[PDB]
Amino acid sequence: RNHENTLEKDLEAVGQEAQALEERLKAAEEELKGLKDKYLRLLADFDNYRKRMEEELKAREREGVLKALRALLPVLDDLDRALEFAEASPESIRQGVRAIRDGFFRILAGLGVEEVPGEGEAFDPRYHEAVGLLPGEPGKVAKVFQRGFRMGEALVRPARVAVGEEKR
Amino acid sequence: ENTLEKDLEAVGQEAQALEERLKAAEEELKGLKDKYLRLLADFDNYRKRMEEELKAREREGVLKALRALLPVLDDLDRALEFAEASPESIRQGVRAIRDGFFRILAGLGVEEVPGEGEAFDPRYHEAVGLLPGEPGKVAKVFQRGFRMGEALVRPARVAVGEEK
């Protein structure tokens, strides 16, 4: 009577504890789909942008090769200029080649490439490839069989070298 | 009694399931902001990595080239030595070094642009004047021009043939 009719809400107050658990699970529809946008739009660019730079990179390198090739072609030119003219005198060509070499250096310096230390300097593994040793001051480069270069911190290529050794 | 109340127990089967479609969502969807947080930490990673990547990437090319061309400098020294003993041989060395240079260039994939006798082409040639030879054709190459496949390392300064 006044105990089942007044407490009949036993299934009434539940309407707010049920429709709500069915009012939120409905909104989560764009919670696994709506988010599928910010995601599938971020993973659509990460597989795109990285594909765009996959280009801008292989290009910046190509650009680097060119930058060098261009700076160095003048040597080929001088080699040509020598074969067609310089043949004047053996000591004329000798001086010409000397000149070409000197040029190659300036060109390298131009791209900021310095030659690592050599004959007389301290043998240093960071810049030197020791091929064996020859008479000279120990711990010091006795002879350079191949110039080594470094541009800044980077090693273009180490110098193949002979390290000094005191005779007895 | 047995079915007058059990046939209702079917309604409770829904509410019992409602806690499976929303209780399982926030289960795996509890990290859908994480497996995404990383996908943005890597996509926001390149955004700053490229400025560097690209730079050092050019150095890569320059080194790649220098690496391949230093042998020329090596041969120049080698040549100067053969000449220190027999001056006459110097001419022979230069010829070798020069031919060497071409091979190297080939190695990096650069070819010489069409020359003497070949049709003038602005893609590769820089006409600076005229000189005897088939009209509209390269008559003499004053400076070699090279192309790396599509790109142009540098154009050949050339003289084009005069018609008539």
Method in brief: X-ray
The C-alpha atoms of residue B48 and residue B66 are separated, in whole angstroms, by 29
The C-alpha atoms of residue A145 and residue B116 are separated, in whole angstroms, by 40
Please give the C-alpha separations between residue A142 and each of A35, A73, A132, A136, B70, in angstroms, as whole numbers: 69, 33, 10, 5, 22
The C-alpha atoms of residue A22 and residue B91 are separated, in whole angstroms, by 94
Structure tokens at A11: 């299934």
Shortest Cα–Cα distance, A65 to chain B (Å): 4
Instruction: Mark yes or no for CB contact B50/A46 under 8 Å.
Output: no
The C-alpha atoms of residue B29 and residue B25 are separated, in whole angstroms, by 6
Q: Which of B46, B80, B146 sits opposite A97 (nearest CB)?
A: B80
The structural domains of chain A, ordered by start, are: 1-111 (3.90.20.20), 112-168 (2.30.22.10)
Chain A residue with CA closest to B35: the answer is A39
The one-letter amino acid code at B50 reads: M
- Residue A80: how many CA atoms within 13 Å on its side-chain side? 11
Residue A109 in contact with partner chain B when CB distance is under 8 A? no
Residue A90 in contact with partner chain B when CB distance is under 8 A? yes
Q: Which of B15, B39, B146 sits opposite A18 (nearest CB)?
A: B15
Instruction: Mark yes or no for CB contact B25/A42 under 8 Å.
Output: no
Chain B residue with CA closest to A60: the answer is B58
Residue B106 in contact with partner chain A when CB distance is under 8 A? no
Resolution (angstroms) equals 3.2
Are residues A129 and A143 in contact, defined by beta-carbon separation less than 8 angstroms? no
Are residues A127 and A117 in contact, defined by beta-carbon separation less than 8 angstroms? yes
Structure tokens at B133: 């030879």
Question: Which residues in chain A have their CB less than 8 angstroms from residue B151's CB?
Answer: 62, 66
